[PDB]
Swiss-Prot record, chain A:
Function, in words: The TFIID basal transcription factor complex plays a major role in the initiation of RNA polymerase II (Pol II)-dependent transcription. TFIID recognizes and binds promoters with or without a TATA box via its subunit TBP, a TATA-box-binding protein, and promotes assembly of the pre-initiation complex (PIC). The TFIID complex consists of TBP and TBP-associated factors (TAFs), including TAF1, TAF2, TAF3, TAF4, TAF5, TAF6, TAF7, TAF8, TAF9, TAF10, TAF11, TAF12 and TAF13. The TFIID complex structure can be divided into 3 modules TFIID-A, TFIID-B, and TFIID-C.
Protein family per UniProt: Belongs to the TAF8 family.
Inducing or repressing factors: Induced with triglyceride accumulation.
Protein's recorded name: Transcription initiation factor TFIID subunit 8
Subunit and partners: Component of the TFIID basal transcription factor complex, composed of TATA-box-binding protein TBP, and a number of TBP-associated factors (TAFs), including TAF1, TAF2, TAF3, TAF4, TAF5, TAF6, TAF7, TAF8, TAF9, TAF10, TAF11, TAF12 and TAF13. Interacts with TBP, TAF1, TAF6, TAF10, TAF11 and TAF13. Component also of a small TAF complex (SMAT) containing TAF8, TAF10 and SUPT7L. Forms a heterodimer with TAF10. Interaction with TAF10 is mediated mainly via its histone fold domain while interaction with SUPT7L is via its C-terminal region.
Anything else known: 'Taube nuss' means 'empty nut' in German.
Subcellular location: Nucleus; Cytoplasm
UniProtKB/Swiss-Prot annotation, chain B:
Tissue: Expressed in all tissues tested.
Domain of life: Eukaryota
Residues of the full protein shown: 801 to 987 of 1199
Gene source species: Homo sapiens
Function according to Swiss-Prot or TrEMBL: The TFIID basal transcription factor complex plays a major role in the initiation of RNA polymerase II (Pol II)-dependent transcription. TFIID recognizes and binds promoters with or without a TATA box via its subunit TBP, a TATA-box-binding protein, and promotes assembly of the pre-initiation complex (PIC). The TFIID complex consists of TBP and TBP-associated factors (TAFs), including TAF1, TAF2, TAF3, TAF4, TAF5, TAF6, TAF7, TAF8, TAF9, TAF10, TAF11, TAF12 and TAF13. TAF2 forms a promoter DNA binding subcomplex of TFIID, together with TAF7 and TAF1.
Protein name: Transcription initiation factor TFIID subunit 2
Subcellular location per the Swiss-Prot or TrEMBL entry: Nucleus
Length: 52, 187
């Protein structure tokens, strides 16, 4: 079969349930902290310590 | 629940002051509450109720000495153009600040704003939970109410309080708690 016949490649299952929703929720946390850092250094800023 | 992750005993000697960027799980809690404060600055969902619980959390963090005992955040949330509930929780917070910490100046500010603001219900709740949670507690007078604070308080019972009945009723409650049935040990 290694020369004559052929096959088909789908190649991406990735269906690991808890791992999937870990990916999604971790990404949501990322976008949270990203926009936080952005408007953090963007707008009027007051701190918790001095100069953070 | 994170506010009820009360950890009083990290700073053994002096760790208040950006020293560890104080550590370690406290910082994670700080990350989450910082997130939610800026989310409700952006999203805001329903009365800034999240922001309210956050402000209570930040004060309880000051009551364990991790973010230092500084009112200027809460002061910047006792301002005019916010919601009531934000403002009302900031006032509860800064009242306990002036309870345990001995800030004379912000007490003076507080009484000046009891005099001066348009909203009634903040004056109502300032005086209510000021009396529920007092500084200057009677016959325990280390922060020296006898100097001129009795004077201005007597004034605010008399003056500046013919707006409403209940404001001077609260001032009656103030003199009930602070030095009730007597001379205040002035003269």
């Amino acid at each position: 079969x290694x020369x004559x016949x052929x096959x088909x490649x789908x190649x991406x299952x990735x269906x690991x349930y808890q791992v999937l929703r870990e990916k999604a929720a971790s990404q949501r946390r990322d976008v949270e902290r990203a926009l936080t850092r952005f408007m953090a250094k963007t707008g009027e800023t007051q701190s918790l310590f001095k100069d953070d | 629940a994170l506010a009820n992750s009360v950890t009083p005993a990290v700073s053994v000697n002096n760790e208040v002051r950006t020293l560890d960027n104080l550590n370690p799980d406290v910082r994670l809690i700080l990350e989450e509450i910082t997130r939610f404060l800026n989310m409700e600055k952006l999203l805001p969902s329903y009365r800034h109720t999240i922001t309210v619980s956050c402000l209570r959390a930040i004060r309880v963090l000051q009551k364990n000495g991790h973010v230092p005992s500084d009112p200027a955040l809460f002061k910047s949330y006792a301002e005019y153009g916010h919601f009531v509930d934000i403002r009302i929780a900031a006032l509860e917070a800064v009242v306990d600040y002036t309870k345990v910490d001995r800030s004379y100046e912000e007490l003076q500010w507080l009484l000046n704003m009891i005099q001066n603001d348009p909203v009634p219900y903040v004056r109502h709740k300032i005086l209510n939970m000021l009396t529920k949670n007092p500084p200057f507690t009677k016959n325990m007078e280390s922060p020296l109410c006898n100097e001129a604070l009795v004077d201005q308080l007597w004034k605010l019972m008399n003056s500046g309080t013919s707006h409403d009945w209940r404001l001077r009723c609260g001032a009656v409650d103030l003199y009930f708690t602070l030095f009730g049935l007597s001379r205040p040990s002035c003269l």
